[PDB]
Amino acid sequence: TDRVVKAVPFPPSHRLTAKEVFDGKPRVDILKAHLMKEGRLEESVALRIITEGASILRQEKNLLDIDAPVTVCGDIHGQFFDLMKLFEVGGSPANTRYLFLGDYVDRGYFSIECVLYLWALKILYPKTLFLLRGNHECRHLTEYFTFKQECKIKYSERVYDACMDAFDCLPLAALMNQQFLCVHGGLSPEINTLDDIRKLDRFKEPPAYGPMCDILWSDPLEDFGNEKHFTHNTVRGCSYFYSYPAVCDFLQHNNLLSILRAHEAQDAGYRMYRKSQTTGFPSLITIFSAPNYLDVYNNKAAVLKYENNVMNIRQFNCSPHPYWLPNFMDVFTWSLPFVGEKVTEMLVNVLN
C-alpha cells in the first residue's frame, strides 16, 4: 500500500511561501527545479509575481524599439517542457536578447506554469526581454477553452482575475532595428502609416472591428502568384486578408523591409515567400515554435536568429511531458457512473 510501481517521481506537496523565491531579484533556479516536478506555489506569492510583472509592463510604450542582436521566437501554447528546450537551444537570458510573439496560454495543460516562469524572468530582467500580445489573451476566448478550469482547479479564481488584469496592458507593435516590423498577425487596409499605430489605446478587451481587432486576427493570402486589399476571410470569420500589392505599397510608402508572423502552423516550422524585387529580401516569414501541435501534426519547430546582417534559421526537436485527464478530472468522478451501472445490472440479473 506504499507504492505499486516505483519507477515514477513523486510530486512535492509543500507550496513555497516567500521562503527562497525572493532575495530585489526573484530566484530562478529554484523555479526551474520546482516547476519541472509539477509542484505548486502559494497563492500570495503568485499574486505578488503577477502584479509586479503587470506593474513593470504598464509603463511600456505601444511600439517597442530594440537594437540589432535579437533572437525572435514563435508562439508556445503553454508547453513547458518544450519551452525549456527552446531556452536551452537558444541562449541564456543573461547573454542573449529575446522577443516573443505569440500567445502564451490556451490549448495546453501547463499554461499557468509557463506564464509564471516568463513573468518572473521578465521581472528579474527588465531590459533584455520583450513580450508581444496575441489573439488568445481575451475574455471570451480563454473562457471558451481550457484556461478558466486550469485556474479554478490548481489555484483560486483570484489568480485568474489578476492574470486578466495583467494581460490587459501588453504592447502590440514591436518595431525592431528600425528596418523590420514584427506584429503578431498581419496589417490591415485601414492602417496606413507607422505613426497611425502610435495613438490607439490597448487598455481594454479588443472590439469586434477596427485596427485593434485587425492587427491580431488578420491572415496572409494563400494563393500567391495570382491576379489582383480587403478581401474577407473564411476560416477565422473575424478579420481581413491582404494581397502582395498591399504589402509592396506599405513597404514603399514607409522605409521598411518585411513583416513577421506567428500563426500558420507548418510541417517544416518556417516558410519564406517570394523575394521583393526592390531589395532582394523576402517580404513575409512565418515562424512556428511548438513541436507536435495538438499531438497530431507531428511537426518540427524553429527559432529565428539575427546577427551581423545574416538571417539564419535553426530547427528544433520534441520532448515528453506527464499525463492529465481531459478537462482535469479526478478518478472518483471519472469512474463512479460506471460502478453504478455495473452494480445495478448485476443485482437485477441475480435477484430475478
Binding site: L294, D295, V296, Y323, P326, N327, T333
Partner: protein
C-alpha cells in the same frame, strides 16, 4: 440517430462478426469543432466487444457497417448518445457528437 458519411473508403471484403473485438483509433469532437478526447493523445488504441452494452448504442449500431481500413465521420444524435443525463464534467445535456473512428484491424 446514427449516420455514416465516408471520407476515404477502401477494401470492403471483410466485415465484423457478432462477438469479436475490434481495434479503433478515434478523435472525439463536438458540433462546432472543439475536441475533447483522442486515441492519439495516449499511444494505445481502443478495444470493445461488439454486441454487449459497454459502449453507447450509436457505436454499436454504426461501426458494424464499416470494414477493415476505412475512415468515416459519424453523427450520434442525442437519443443513442449520452442523452439528457449526459456526463459530469465533459458533455453538456443534449449534445451532438462527431467522431472520426477509423477501424484498423480485426481480431
Amino acid at each position: 440517430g446514427v449516420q455514416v458519411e465516408t471520407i476515404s473508403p477502401g477494401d470492403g471484403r471483410t466485415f465484423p462478426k457478432r462477438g469479436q473485438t475490434c481495434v479503433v483509433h478515434y478523435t472525439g469532437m463536438l458540433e462546432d469543432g472543439k475536441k475533447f478526447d483522442s486515441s492519439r493523445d495516449r499511444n494505445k488504441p481502443f478495444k470493445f466487444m461488439l454486441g454487449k452494452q459497454e459502449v453507447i448504442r450509436g457505436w454499436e449500431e454504426g461501426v458494424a457497417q464499416m470494414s477493415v481500413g476505412q475512415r468515416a465521420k459519424l453523427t450520434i444524435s442525442p437519443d443513442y448518445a449520452y442523452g439528457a443525463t449526459g456526463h459530469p464534467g465533459i458533455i453538456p445535456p443534449h449534445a451532438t457528437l462527431v467522431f472520426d473512428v477509423e477501424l484498423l484491424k480485426l481480431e
